[PDB]
């Protein structure tokens, strides 16, 4: 349970750095922008996850449908197994039925 | 985001201060000490 004996270097975060100052800027792009682009377009991320959401099973299932043929063998195999597991678990296990 | 308990040290002291004056291993070892302290209260 030994706790560190030396004060860490105090980390100074300036909140006025560029990324923090400009945060959330174009979020209203739809409303103020005479709707053309939905805020989804702003989302930088994995291809299957842009502007979408879901529980781990749905997530995996979707990843496989979209990028499943660009995947590495090991990773595709792992994904299939994860899907099968999650399927069995969600459908057949739990308290609530 | 991994979260570990940093302060565990103090968590233990709040048991162990009540155990100081016991005889045997009860006055050191958190397991034994905890049970002994509860019995004492």
């Amino acid at each position: 349970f030994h706790v560190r004996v030396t004060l860490p270097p105090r980390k100074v975060v300036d909140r006025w750095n560029e990324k923090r100052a400009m945060f959330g800027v174009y979020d209203n792009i739809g409303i103020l922008g005479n709707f053309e682009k939905h805020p989804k377009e702003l989302i930088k991320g994995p291809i299957w996850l842009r502007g979408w959401k879901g529980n781990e099973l749905q997530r995996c299932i979707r990843k496989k449908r979209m990028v499943g043929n660009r995947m590495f063998i090991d990773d595709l195999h792992n994904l299939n197994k994860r899907i099968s597991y999650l399927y069995k678990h969600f459908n057949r296990h739990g308290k609530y039925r | 985001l991994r979260s570990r308990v940093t302060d565990r040290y103090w968590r233990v002291q709040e048991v162990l201060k009540h155990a100081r004056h016991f005889r045997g291993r009860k006055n050191r070892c958190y397991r034994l000490a905890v049970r002994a302290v509860t019995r004492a209260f």
Binding site: V3, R4, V5, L7, P8 | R4, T6, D7, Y9, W10
Partner: peptide, 26 residues
């Protein structure tokens, strides 16, 4: 390593306490 200031600071206080227990200041 564990990431945080808090426990480190709080321990600095213990260190000071022991320091004062082993050598009492005049």
């Amino acid at each position: 390593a564990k990431k945080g200031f808090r426990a480190a600071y709080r321990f600095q206080k213990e260190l000071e306490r022991w320091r004062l227990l082993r050598c009492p200041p005049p």
